[PDB]
């Protein structure tokens, strides 16, 4: 019986890690490194997800930009993030109920698995939307800030890590319900 | 001559990361119908058209159809791009 418990708790901790990645990219400090070292003068952008920093050293807001329909894509994006987090927390809650019975079960666990799948389904869409938006932000001449060092992460990759956290959670818990 | 990269060129790396993650997401769904077993079955799904052995609809077989449609679209787009 120690085996199933170790599997379950391991999956719980893994999904907790995924939540840490969720917080990680929800708290991105610079989504993309950026530069415009114009031979004007040298420039180094550091675009946080809601916080376009410049680097003397400075960080700036710059959120909710062009254009309109894209802003709505941001709405769907953030809503998808919130529901993502909700499915996470419901997952951990169903895990805690499993702990309470460790202190349906199957019928409950699969539910969380499903939600976690849904969670994984949403954020992977969400980031697309975000990346979609980001490309669009680059596509429309980003005011002046159009860095050549275009690149995602670091934290966005962690958003994927929380994704695969929910994924592995769902897989191992499915391995548990298959019992 | 490019090494390896030239094959990679027609479709962006990000798109690859996306198709990979998406497939991984599709993969587990088959297990829900039932970490290794049905994931292996999904490995038996991408390899050939899409999914099998579903006792008429059930649940994930329609996922197999959507997945078939999906991989179909992507490979078509890829080939068109290289062209």
């Amino acid at each position: 019986k120690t085996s199933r418990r170790g599997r379950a708790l391991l999956a719980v901790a893994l999904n907790l890690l995924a939540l840490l990645f969720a917080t990680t990219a929800f708290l991105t400090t610079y989504w993309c490194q950026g530069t415009q070292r114009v031979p004007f003068q040298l420039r180094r952008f550091h675009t946080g997800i809601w916080y376009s920093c410049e680097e003397g050293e400075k960080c700036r807001s710059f959120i909710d930009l062009a254009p309109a329909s894209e802003k709505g894509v941001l709405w769907l994006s953030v809503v998808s993030e919130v529901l993502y987090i909700l499915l996470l927390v419901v997952g951990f809650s169903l895990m805690c109920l499993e702990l309470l019975h460790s202190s349906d079960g199957l019928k409950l666990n699969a539910f969380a698995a499903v939600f976690t799948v849904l969670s994984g389904l949403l954020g992977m869409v969400a980031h697309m939307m975000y990346t979609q938006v980001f490309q669009v932000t680059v596509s429309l001449g980003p005011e002046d800030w159009r860095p050549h060092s275009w690149d995602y992460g670091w934290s966005f990759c962690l958003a994927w890590g929380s994704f695969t956290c929910c994924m592995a959670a769902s897989v191992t818990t499915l391995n548990s319900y298959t019992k | 001559k490019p090494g390896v990269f030239s094959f990679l060129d027609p479709l962006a790396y990000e798109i690859w990361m996306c198709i990979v993650f998406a497939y991984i997401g599709v993969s587990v769904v088959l297990f829900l119908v039932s970490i290794f077993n049905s994931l292996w079955f999904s490995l038996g799904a991408f390899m050939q058209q899409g999914c099998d052995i579903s006792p008429r609809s059930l649940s994930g077989r329609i996922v197999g159809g959507v997945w078939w449609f999906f991989t179909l679209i992507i490979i078509s787009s890829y080939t068109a791009n290289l062209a």
């Binding site: 019928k107 499903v114 799948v117 849904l118 389904l121 992977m124 869409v125 697309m128 990346t131 979609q132 490309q135 | 962006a12 990000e14 798109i15 996306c18 998406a22 997401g25 599709v26 769904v29 829900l32 119908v33 059930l58 649940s59 994930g60 329609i62 996922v63 959507v66 997945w67 999906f70 679209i73 992507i74 787009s77």
Partner: peptide, 29 residues
């Protein structure tokens, strides 16, 4: 990546729909 992302959307949506079908099928039983 966008033009394909639109297909990602229908993919994921089909996934969730099929999941709902799995749920009601778990409801009959």
């Amino acid at each position: 990546l966008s033009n394909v992302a639109g297909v990602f959307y229908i993919l994921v949506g089909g996934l969730g729909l099929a999941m709902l079908v799995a749920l009601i099928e778990f409801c009959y039983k």
